[PDB]
């Protein structure tokens, strides 16, 4: 691929692959020139080496890439890593329909809901809004609907409150240590840019308010909502799984 400023970038495997291609060609030539064995051997020795540096570099002397001190990343290093397969290694693959910010308090909440910024929720649920706007006929087509929320027309808030209602979200805070690290809440729209967190759940998360951030996740499919409601909901997990005593103790 090209970059800006007309400079190119490329994988290290390319430096490797050429040398194997080159040395192979140069040996085919030497067999028809009937070169002395002392030479055609040395070529073989180099090809046997260059292949090995291609597959798993490091069980030899570590052939470096052209003009660059840094070692070149081999085929084996694309599987190996820290630890094992990178994709399954932390982290771990990023995921659409998510976000985060600072969390704050809000004692006026009931325990089965949570405070999600007005500004954030708009951007998050955008495909839901595009559907409902044109379903009820307030938009002729999606391309029109797109322009409406771009205009930030006041009509959308009343639509938004419909789509938000019975749809839980998942709240997750930084080091997920036990199963209580993800819990599901019902969103209540808030003017402000902070997440509002019911104070009693702070104990389970080992959340303080020194500026910790939490993530939100939208359960998309119909299945995931009913899954999040009967298993991951706040009120369903009030006992600690380590020792049967309540974890929703007053702090």
């Amino acid at each position: 691929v090209p970059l800006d400023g007309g400079r190119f970038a490329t994988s290290d495997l390319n430096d490797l692959y050429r040398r194997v291609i080159n040395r192979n060609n140069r040996l085919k030539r030497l067999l028809d020139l009937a070169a002395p064995d002392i030479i055609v051997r040395n070529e073989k020795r180099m090809l046997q080496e260059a292949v090995d540096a291609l597959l798993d570099n490091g069980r030899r002397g570590r052939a470096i890439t052209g003009s660059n001190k840094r070692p070149l990343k081999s085929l084996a290093d694309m599987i190996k890593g820290k630890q094992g397969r990178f994709r399954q290694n932390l982290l771990g693959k990023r995921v659409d329909y998510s976000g985060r910010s600072v969390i704050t308090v809000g004692p006026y909440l009931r325990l089965h809901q949570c405070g999600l910024p007005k500004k954030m929720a708009l951007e998050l649920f955008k495909p839901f809004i595009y559907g409902k706007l044109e379903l009820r006929g307030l938009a002729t087509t999606i391309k029109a609907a797109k322009k409406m929320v771009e205009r930030e027309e006041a009509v959308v808030w009343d639509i938004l409150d419909e789509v938000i209602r019975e749809h839980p979200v998942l709240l997750n805070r930084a080091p997920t240590l036990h199963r209580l690290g993800i819990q599901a809440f019902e969103p209540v729209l808030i003017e402000g840019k902070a997440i509002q967190l019911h104070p009693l759940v702070c104990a389970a998360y080992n959340a303080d308010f020194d500026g910790d951030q939490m993530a939100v996740h939208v359960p998309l499919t119909l299945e995931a909502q009913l899954e999040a409601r009967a298993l991951m909901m706040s009120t369903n997990n009030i006992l600690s799984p380590a020792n049967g005593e309540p974890i929703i103790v007053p702090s």
């Binding site: 040395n42 020795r45 030899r60 002397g61």
Partner: peptide, 10 residues
Amino acid sequence: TTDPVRMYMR
């Protein structure tokens, strides 16, 4: 690896 530079020279 008995470093290749030597055993050609030899």
